[PDB]
């Protein structure tokens, strides 16, 4: 009976404000409990042993690398780092549910997606050291990874900018009849930026095959979620845009996998966006620039509810792992990370001429004049520059 174009609804003859349901919000999908036990058999994906061992080995290898590179930062060996502690399940559970060629846009606390896609340790290292092996040519801050071969778009610092970009890549995929999905990761803090409202709405109106994957780890640097929003987290925003949405236990690699697998299948078939909010807890500091004890419970999470521990218990059930395997893999991982670390530290940095290329595809003549001016400068004053560990 109402005729207004902007909504489809009935009249109501009594004044009633709509109250948000925040106290009992959208429920948290779980597949296994904290002891690694399957709760509802009909939900178990029954992934094969080799794939579940890959989930486990990818998480723990990332954790090994994080410990080493966090210490290297503390020693001044690299300028910056950011760990993935407590969130390795969200990374690896979702990556495993994607096609190899699905395109990924991230935030910065995603490295497990690359690890699952077999990104070499040498290349994670090369980017953190800015050495000659870095395909990013040493130009970005550490942890700003990217890989064209593995369809992982280079990370940039400005939060949430990748959200509407991921939507555009997904529109282009739709047109290309790619049968590919784009996934876009961001944190609950970044979700406050205007570009999240842009991307969420554009994906719905333009009918794009995209998964928005929000990691809600309770903090954005020092800011707890009670100061970040007052609705029922990020999941409750999706339906307001017309987006199918779900909330999952981010410390449960099977719940994350099941949700991403189903969102991927439906987004690619239906050309519609899906939103997954994975609840988790940021166990580590925000970054090497943050001492989190200045504003916060961490040991509850680390000891009582961790994705690596939870999956270890599951393995230890199927009889697929044991203490001997655990020790041998801990040793082998550490060795592999240390081999890459040693190599990375002994590589030179790229030629300083590389500060001028790729600004435009072709260096403008005026930019080439500046390059030449640096080359002349270094000829005269080079003793005053750290030329000795730069290439050429």
């Amino acid at each position: 009976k109402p005729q207004f174009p902007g909504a489809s609804a009935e009249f109501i003859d009594k004044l009633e404000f709509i109250q948000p349901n925040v106290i009992s919000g959208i429920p948290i999908y779980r597949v296994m409990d904290r002891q690694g036990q399957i709760i509802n058999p009909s939900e178990d994906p029954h992934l094969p042993k080799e794939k579940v061992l890959k989930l486990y080995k990818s998480m723990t290898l990332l954790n090994t690398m994080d410990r080493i590179l966090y210490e290297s930062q503390r020693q001044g060996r690299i300028s910056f780092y950011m760990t993935n502690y407590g969130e390795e399940g969200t990374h690896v559970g979702s990556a495993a549910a994607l096609d190899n060629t699905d395109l990924v846009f991230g935030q910065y606390r995603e490295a497990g997606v690359l690890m699952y896609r077999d990104y070499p340790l040498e290349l994670f290292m090369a980017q953190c050291y800015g050495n000659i092996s870095d395909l990013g040519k040493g130009r970005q801050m550490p942890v700003h990874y990217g890989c064209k071969e593995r369809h992982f778009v280079t990370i940039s610092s400005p939060l949430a900018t990748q959200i509407p970009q991921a939507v555009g890549a997904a529109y282009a995929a739709k047109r290309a009849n790619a049968n590919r999905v784009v996934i876009c990761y961001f944190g609950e803090g970044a979700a406050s930026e205007g570009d999240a409202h842009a991307g969420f709405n554009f994906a719905a109106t333009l009918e794009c095959p995209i998964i928005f994957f929000c990691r809600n780890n309770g903090y954005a640097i020092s800011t707890p979620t009670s100061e970040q929003y007052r609705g029922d987290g990020i999941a409750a925003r999706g339906p307001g845009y017309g987006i199918m949405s779900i909330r999952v236990d981010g410390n449960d690699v099977f719940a994350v996998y099941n949700a991403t697998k189903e969102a991927r299948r439906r987004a690619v078939a239906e050309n519609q966006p899906f939103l997954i909010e994975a609840m988790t807890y940021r166990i580590g500091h925000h970054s090497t620039s943050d001492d989190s004890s200045a504003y916060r419970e961490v040991g509850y999470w680390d000891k009582q509810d961790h994705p690596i521990s939870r999956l270890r218990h599951y393995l230890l059930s199927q009889g697929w792992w044991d203490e001997e395997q655990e020790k041998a893999w801990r040793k082998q991982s550490r060795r592999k990370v240390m081999e890459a670390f040693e190599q990375a530290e002994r590589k030179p940095k790229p030629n300083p001429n590389l500060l001028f290329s790729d600004v435009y595809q072709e260096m403008p003549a005026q930019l080439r004049k500046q390059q030449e001016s640096l080359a002349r400068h270094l000829q005269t004053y080079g003793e005053h520059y750290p030329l000795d560990h730069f290439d050429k």
Partner: protein
């Protein structure tokens, strides 16, 4: 008012833009055009007929959100497809300033050329329009000129707009193409129906002269052309008139060659003086042509205020303000 390529037809500047866009979508199957109100043809008619001809998946309306328009276009371009975004008035490009300056411009550099958004072009109506006041009149090019990694291009006519717009669409770098909206329905001229290109980063000397160099872009080129005629008739002064065309990267060589010959330079633009792009041209010409300068380089620009409604006739750097500055410079 204040102011060889095959078959041609008379086109005004809006029609020349539609012709460039039609040529682009005919020959590039990846290309799409999007933004606010583009589907029915656009608020300045620049996209009329294109959705019907090429399809709703290729010429389409977005939600009303400029940061989203530009982010979305960058994402299309990351996949290699040509993305031609519209921003409805240049005054409303600022919501997208972060996506343009922190993202589009830096995309190729920061990835070591693993990713890029070269196939993005952003087009937007620009410049004064007699009564546009603060938010329908702006000329934002100097804000963008301080951002390495984007190109900024401004045509003076229908023939120039089609060839420059085709070059932006096909250039492998994100480009902002500003369309002087007061020209959209001003006089037509002959424009080739088939595609052709005019190079970026190349100024055009449209009238040779020996006493003074005048530089401008957009509608202001017609103002300085008239100033040249005034100076010839009233002062017997021979002016070399140059359309800069590309704001960045700009054609330093053509401008410096002219000033070495003439020894005098006046640069004019509608945008406010302070921080305006005339400042960059002046300071560069001074560095390169110092020994040749007979008089200080003059900048005749909009005043350092927001762009006013009822006072527009008094605000703009019109032909009398340019002429008077030229007269003083000639007598320095």
């Amino acid at each position: 008012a204040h102011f060889e390529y095959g078959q041609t037809q008379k086109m005004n500047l809006f029609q020349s833009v539609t012709s460039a866009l039609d040529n682009s979508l005919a020959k590039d199957p990846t290309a799409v055009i999007f933004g606010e109100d583009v589907a029915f043809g656009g608020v300045f008619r620049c996209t009329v007929g294109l959705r019907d001809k090429y399809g709703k998946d290729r010429v389409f309306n977005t939600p009303l959100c400029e940061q989203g328009i530009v982010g979305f276009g960058i994402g299309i371009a990351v996949t290699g497809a040509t993305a031609i975004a519209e921003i409805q008035f240049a005054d409303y490009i600022f919501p997208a300033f972060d996506q343009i300056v922190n993202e589009a411009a830096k995309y190729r550099y920061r990835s070591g050329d693993l990713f890029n958004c070269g196939s993005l072009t952003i087009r937007s109506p620009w410049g004064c329009v007699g009564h546009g006041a603060l938010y329908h009149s702006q000329s934002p090019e100097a804000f963008f000129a301080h951002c390495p990694g984007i190109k900024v291009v401004i045509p003076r006519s229908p023939f120039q707009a089609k060839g420059l717009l085709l070059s932006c669409i096909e250039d492998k770098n994100p480009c902002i193409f500003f369309e002087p909206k007061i020209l959209y329905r001003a006089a037509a001229e002959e424009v080739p129906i088939e595609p052709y290109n005019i190079p970026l980063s190349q100024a055009e000397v449209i009238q040779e002269g020996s006493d003074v160099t005048l530089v401008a872009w957009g509608t202001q080129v017609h103002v300085i052309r008239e100033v040249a005629s005034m100076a010839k008739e009233k002062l017997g002064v021979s002016c070399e008139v140059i359309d800069l065309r590309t704001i960045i990267p700009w054609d330093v060589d053509t401008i410096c060659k002219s000033v070495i010959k003439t020894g005098r330079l006046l640069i004019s633009h509608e945008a406010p003086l302070t921080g305006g792009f005339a400042s960059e041209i002046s300071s560069t010409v001074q560095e390169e042509c110092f020994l040749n300068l007979e008089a200080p380089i003059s900048r005749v620009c909009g005043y350092d205020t927001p762009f006013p409604h009822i006072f527009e006739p008094f605000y703009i750097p019109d032909k009398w303000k340019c002429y008077d500055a030229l007269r003083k410079m000639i007598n320095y």
